[PDB]
Amino acid sequence: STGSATTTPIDSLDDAYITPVQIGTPAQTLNLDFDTGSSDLWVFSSETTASEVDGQTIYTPSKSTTAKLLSGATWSISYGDGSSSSGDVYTDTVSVGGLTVTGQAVESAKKVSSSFTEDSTIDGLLGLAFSTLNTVSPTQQKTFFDNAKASLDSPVFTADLGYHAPGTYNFGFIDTTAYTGSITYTAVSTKQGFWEWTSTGYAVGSGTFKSTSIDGIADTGTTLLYLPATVVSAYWAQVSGAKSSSSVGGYVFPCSATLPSFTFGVGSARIVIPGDYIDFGPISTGSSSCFGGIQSSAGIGINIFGDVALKAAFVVFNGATTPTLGFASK
Numbered sequence: 574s575t576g577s578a579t580t581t582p583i584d585s586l587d588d589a590y591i592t593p594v595q596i597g598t599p600a601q602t603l604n605l606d607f608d609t610g611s612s613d614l615w616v617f618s619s620e621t622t623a624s625e626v627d628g629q630t631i632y633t634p635s636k637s638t639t640a641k642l643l644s645g646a647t648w649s650i651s652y653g654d655g656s657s658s659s660g661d662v663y664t665d666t667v668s669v670g671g672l673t674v675t676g677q678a679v680e681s682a683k684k685v686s687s688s689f690t691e692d693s694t695i696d697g698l699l700g701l702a703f704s705t706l707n708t709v710s711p712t713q714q715k716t717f718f719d720n721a722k723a724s725l726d727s728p729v730f731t732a733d734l735g736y737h738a739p740g741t742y743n744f745g746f747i748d749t750t751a752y753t754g755s756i757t758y759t760a761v762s763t764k765q766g767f768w769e770w771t772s773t774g775y776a777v778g779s780g781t782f783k784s785t786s787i788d789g790i791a792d793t794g795t796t797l798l799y800l801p802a803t804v805v806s807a808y809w810a811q812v813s814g815a816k817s818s819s820s821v822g823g824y825v826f827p828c829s830a831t832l833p834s835f836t837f838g839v840g841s842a843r844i845v846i847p848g849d850y851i852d853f854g855p856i857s858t859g860s861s862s863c864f865g866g867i868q869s870s871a872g873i874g875i876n877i878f879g880d881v882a883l884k885a886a887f888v889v890f891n892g893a894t895t896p897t898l899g900f901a902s903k
């Protein structure tokens with residue numbers, strides 16, 4: 574089997590991407606944030622505290638003839654940005670772009686933190702990291718990909734995120750028309766439950782390539798590119814007027830600036846992030862200070878190749894017995 578779904582930026586800055594997902598019988602379509610940095614499929618629901626729902630589409634398990642309460646199961650997750658959600662669990666039929674999984678754990682939110690409430694466009698998350706990170710207790714549950722994997726033509730999914738434009742998530746096949754040149758594959762460590770890999774280095778603009786190992790995770794659920802402070806300082810030093818602002822919470826730059834590209838290494842291959850991918854616009858409405866898309870990972874504990882990096886590539890998440898990651902230019 575295969576599946577193919579379009580993923581769409583939630584706003585003009587590409588803060589996140591949403592993908593329609595069919596849950597239950599008859600189908601209830603919710604727009605979920607596909608997140609390769611977490612492993613829970615959770616949704617706004619009829620069980621979510623009323624005051625914490627503001628415009629989201631909800632899943633109502635009582636209206637689904639295939640929903641079954643997963644007796645005694647609860648979940649609770651806190652993300653790297655401090656956001657959180659928790660609730661109980663149903664199993665139900667879940668379809669993505671024509672690919673169907675029966676008995677998928679659908680985690681129903683009873684509580685969500687304010688940032689989720691405030692994002693009217695995101696109806697929940699669909700985790701695509703390794704199932705060892707799934708928070709359901711007392712019986713850990715599998716991700717959608719994990720459940721689908723054996724049925725897929727090939728045990729892979731791909732992320733093809735657009736810049737200020739829609740893109741595609743494919744399951745079970747590699748669309749050879751969706752990228753240029755070749756796909757370069759690189760080793761993955763699953764020890765922390767992430768799609769963790771090691772970049773071979775970087776360049777800033779037309780500068781020389783610096784060979785240096787950068788361990789990080791491929792994370793579709795994080796907006797920005799978080800890298801070591803040395804690397805990030807080298808990037809912003811090429812932008813006149815750029816500075817790290819403690820009050821704003823990262824590097825900012827004059828909105829009048831032209832940003833240089835940023836290149837990262839995948840083995841001997843190179844992925845070039847165009848300068849305008851690194852512009853996240855005025856820090857507040859009307860400001861001439863703009864927020865940078867490359868930020869320090871120093872206060873995180875891990876480097877994160879988020880959407881800023883991934884959207885510059887066609888990315889293969891290979892879930893073979895020994896998982897690997899593939900990157901191609903596009």
Ligand SMILES: N[C@@H]1CO[C@H](CNC(=O)c2ccc(F)cc2)[C@H]1O
Nearest residue numbers: 583586588589692695796797853864
């Ligand atoms: N606009 C700036 C650029 O990226 C920063 C961090 N990203 C988010 O705050 C964010 C992430 C996911 C989401 F669904 C909504 C917002 C943000 O301050």
